[PDB]
Symmetry: D2
Subunit: 372 residues, 4 copies
């Protein structure tokens, strides 16, 4: 089936007991057993919950992977994944990963003897030079938050496999709809479902898909033991979100390309980050490993006074944390993303916009009037 | 406020926006800021959500604590708490801690350099000679699952404070209604809110209460960084359950004392574990550090055929894992919780494969006793 | 099984498909059919919804009736019930019914040619004298909101049956736990589930139980045709509420008797309405047709200045509409119950309290300090 | 604002309490009052609930109306609206109105003295000579279920205003995205929000928008008095669905035009009902009063055996009542909706027992056409 179809029919429509065209919300902690260990399906909602299970199956189907896992946040998904490894293991990470990943690697998991190196994963020579004897995994975010740097998933995966390393990809920004990391060699693909997958700024959730029975047993053990699960009401809202992922990302795409084009040709804007501009580092790779450029744009305005006046005049962009929502969001990474900032090239005049599904024309006019 | 009033007025009734007598469900990820850094207290739901904030405050109130933290499960609460420690730290634990706790200490957190010693925490001498220079805390579960063994919280706390150690208490079985560990000198108290606090078998949740601002900054940092948060719908259902925790535990208590007496005098029952029997180890301590015995009773029946007849015939006890629900539940520890441990140490901590665990609900007491009676004869 | 047991085991614990000890929330409008008209159980959520159906079965079991029906409010329950009748039919009602029932009878259903007489149902001679040829039903609320007048359900039912009339009882204040109208001859018993049945001030719902297959077909047709249904999330919260109805009403009872006793012996309070006082009209009948006196108290203080000062000083009673909640509520019927007020004896110094499950001692001390 | 922006910024983003970009779910019955009559706008959830208030405002915005009202179902919305009238009032209705509407008019509201005449509302002469002195409104459903027959809303409205009658439009099939009845002169517009507005087959709800304060006082009085309200959870899910109504209907439209063309040229299909075919009655009107044709297509297949093969073989159309969902749905009107009516008037309004109704979802267009193609051959 085509991608739009898979979002509606990835799992069996018609719940067995009643024919409900939706997954029921199993707001329950426990399950009556017929005999000692013989109501097989479900035993305890931490271990498995039918609403969460439908969600875990759906994300595995959408990334073409072996098994899915649902966590209370993106950060719980990221933490459970790194907790596959042990004291003495080493991880290589994209140098401009999300600040939350930066923080958990450097301020939490360091205290547990998990070692890291931050590397420019755009430079495959530097990635290979970072490999230690105790290295177990390469972790890549593409595009990155918020500079949208593009890393070659197929080349990172090939290097990882040659050196006996797992490839972990944060596919949050592209979603399963635009990019397929497992198809390009990734062992583990993960999502802040809080962003595009839910799509309506109303769920905090993380998803992990693994490509192997061994990884599914090992991540299941971590999720069941440390228990950072997604509840069934949130699981239901996330399943509901997934239904419109295709038509949302298509409208996001159309709006964002026109906005990147207009912002890149503006007197008050001297640099624009967006995979769909030919000027963007690795634009060519962006067109090859993904079917869309996404809906996150970062742009550097000429002065503090331009920034401030953009914030106070914008009508349809809401000043807030997060992204991936049907409504347009704006943040100032320099004043809103704490967790080298200078080294990464995150200017004090840099603005990040999350482009919504408002009319593309209203969003351009709103940005124009804001910079006029 | 008396105890029953606290469960209702622990936090202000009337939210500031509309006066709603209930906490609204903030099904939301993010908040509009007036200016970059000016926001009315909420910026991103993982860091703080107002529904979760009301629940975290409520449980902090009920435990007389500095601040509360809500997690997606009891196991997330225990994990987040032990993750306050770092590689080369040592924790002393109660030896018959809950299975899920055993597993996180011995199969997960061991891989992260956190060391442990399992000790009989009923023996303050043995606790003391497990203290190493890298020891940071003593973790106590009282009463224990499933033998309801009792640990002197006030004695553990005073030993701990004397050796500059943190005291952590798993107060799930007693709840804040019967036992107040921070009052007895605990630094940290946590709950599988999945049990009594929710009380309706319909929320999986963990709660942690800390009694210092330093512990609140540190555990908040872990919560926000590792993100095992409870969502707003579960937060609401757990707040809702908290409202009837006092009257639920009073009914649980009355059914349980009568069933514990009933089972202790039945001829097919060799041994009964319940803190309320005068014959139970540290019954005297149980009556000093808590205002109730629980609603959990384990009893050793006379034979395999009896065990199978009671599972066969009970009408009002449902066979299922978990406990602390308004509906009565039964499990066989040997085949359902302590299947992991060998038969070796299952005679040590006396877990026969004729031991039954019942969680006494709020059905009519006389219905539950009649039900046990018919099943057993 | 005893009453406390029935609240936990009235319906089968263990949902067929997974063994869940709870009813799943069927957040769904429609159901896949195997063949044209052959997924039998469920077809469309207006007509039937499995969460709503569990709730409808539970309330029928708790009132020992034939079938249950769940509506979006008490007033939707009351309206669907009167809409069993037609233009030209006449209904007799307790003269001091809830203001909402007063309003729908006199300002809505009058425009549809449903005729009414309001009668003192404490006076069975006046009830019999009110019967017209076009009379179809006697509608009784006992105790009444807010004066707690007690009507003889068995004598009203016997008169109704002799004259070919249906008996409809609003059992909201007593709940199924304290009073059983069907057992005393009632054909229809109904509830504002918004009050004690939900019990936590967090659901608006109405329930109707009927005693006959004919009434179940006729009310089902009205509920399915006019569609004032309770949604499945509210149905789930109401099922959850019912679980603690017994232990709640027992604590309500203990607190309320002590409060009625203290209020009735107070210098600043010159009259107290509460079924459990020997001085209350028909106290004897109250002890006979119900197992409890309930948790609503109305009291007349000596002056406006006493009332005002009670309102501003009470610590544990919240000034709000509604009742039946675990938290204590206070209202002034003279300034808060619009929809004869003088005729009914609703003084401008009359206070209604809904007694909660706070500690009974804290509630007395709070009322004392408030009148000191 | 363009149409797509309105579905997102129709109401203020950022609630006043915390700045939440989402409407909080007010799972609550009542509100603390400061003083007897001072309350911050909410007193009792049946009269007003803030989550329901946001949805009622949103649908009022999208329909360019005075005020909105949310009910527990489409049928509660129609019932509440017709209950604005009294015994001895007369309403003229579109003759092939939805079955549930037929039933409430002819089996419920007839018993309450409300009179009706069913008329072909495509014939303004016939509408006019059904007007009696006791007539108060003309009720129009355009397009109709299941033959998608089209009624001139602007002509009906002007006839109505000339005879001092109210115009009521059931705008369910078009939604506020394609058709704006109040703009064409309607006083009242309503929706089965169960269909497109929710869009995920997971909420039963009705909405009514009125264009005068007198109609807002009167319908609010009915809503509050008779109490067929939508609860806060359903209100939230319906708000959520509204967010994607524009992009859902654009995708629905593209799949439907292609499937309507596909079916109209297939050799096993005699007749196709769809406002978008140039051959459909009042195609010209359809293109003037609405900016889209729908996502509902009825088609008459060649025989019983074809009908049974398509039900047998379709993979992506689910057999089920209802429509307007992201997942594609199929029904047989003769056996599922118009089983009530005799075979007598089922040849009049041409409802063969080989007529299939499909609701086109937002699956890949080419998947749905391939699916119909394989099923039909
Ligand atoms: C005392 C105690 N602590 C912790 C837990 C674990 O909680 P959860 O199942 O919510 O992860 C349990 C569960 O049985 C328990 O009984
Ligand atoms: C046009 C139209 N109006 C009203 C309704 C009735 O709505 P509900 O099923 O929510 O009562 C429907 C349902 O099919 C409909 O299609
Ligand atoms: C927002 C974000 C996260 C964190 O998700 P939470 O749900 O906030 O824990 C992780 N990765 C990326 C790329 C993100 O954008
Ligand atoms: C509150 C009340 C009602 C009305 O219930 P709603 O849920 O508000 O419609 C009806 N009858 C009685 C006796 C009440 O107390």
């Amino acid at each position: 089936m085509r991608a739009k179809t898979k979002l509606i029919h990835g799992i069996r429509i018609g719940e067995p007991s009643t024919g409900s065209v939706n997954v029921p919300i199993y707001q329950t902690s426990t399950y009556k057993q017929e005999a000692v260990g013989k109501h097989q399906g479900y035993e305890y909602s931490r271990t498995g919950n039918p609403t969460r299970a439908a969600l875990e199956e759906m994300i595995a189907v959408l990334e073409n992977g072996h098994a899915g896992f649902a966590f209370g946040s993106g950060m719980a998904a990221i933490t459970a994944t790194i907790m596959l490894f042990s004291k003495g293991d080493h991880v290589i990470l994209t140098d401009d990963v999300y600040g939350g990943t930066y923080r958990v690697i450097t301020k939490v998991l360091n205290r547990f003897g998990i070692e890291h190196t931050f590397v420019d994963t755009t430079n495959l020579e530097e990635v290979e030079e970072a490999i230690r004897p105790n290295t177990k995994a390469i972790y890549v975010e593409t595009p990155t938050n918020p500079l949208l740097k593009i890393t070659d998933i197929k080349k990172i995966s090939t290097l990882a496999k040659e050196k006996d390393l797992l490839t972990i990809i944060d596919n949050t920004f592209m979603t399963p709809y635009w990019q397929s990391p497992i198809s390009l060699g990734a062992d583990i693909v993960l999502h802040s479902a809080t962003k595009y997958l839910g799509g309506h700024s109303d769920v905090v959730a993380g998803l992990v898909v693994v490509n192997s029975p061994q990884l599914a047993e090992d991540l299941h053990f971590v999720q069941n033991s440390t228990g950072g699960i997604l509840g069934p009401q949130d699981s239901f809202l996330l399943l509901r979100g997934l239904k419109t992922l295709g038509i949302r990302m298509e409208e996001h795409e159309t709006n964002s390309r026109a906005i990147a084009e207009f912002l890149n040709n503006h007197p008050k804007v001297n640099k624009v980050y967006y995979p769909g501009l030919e000027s963007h580092q690795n634009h060519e790779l962006a067109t090859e490993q993904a079917n869309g450029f996404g809906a996150i744009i970062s742009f550097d305005v000429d002065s503090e006074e331009t920034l401030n006046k953009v914030l106070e005049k914008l009508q349809y962009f809401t000043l807030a944390e997060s992204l991936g929502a049907v409504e347009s969001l704006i943040s100032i990474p320099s004043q809103m993303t704490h967790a080298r900032r200078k080294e990464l090239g995150i200017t004090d005049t840099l603005i990040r916009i999350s482009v919504g599904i408002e009319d593309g024309e209203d969003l351009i006019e709103d940005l124009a009037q804001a910079l006029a």
